[PDB]
Write a protein that binds this ligand. Structure first.
Ligand code: CD
Ligand code: CD
Ligand code: CD
Ligand code: CD
Length: 37
């Protein structure tokens, strides 16, 4: 598991800054966020 689940495992994008920054529901559940993709 990446950190969240919205993004694969090695999203370079989160690897910096956890790009999704939901804060609360950071998980986001939706398998596939646009920021990391
Ligand atoms: Cd994420
Ligand atoms: Cd990510
Ligand atoms: Cd993350
Ligand atoms: Cd993301």
């Amino acid at each position: 598991k990446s950190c969240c689940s919205c993004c694969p495992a090695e999203c370079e994008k989160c690897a910096k800054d956890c790009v999704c920054k939901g804060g609360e529901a950071a998980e986001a559940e939706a398998e596939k966020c646009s920021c990391c993709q």
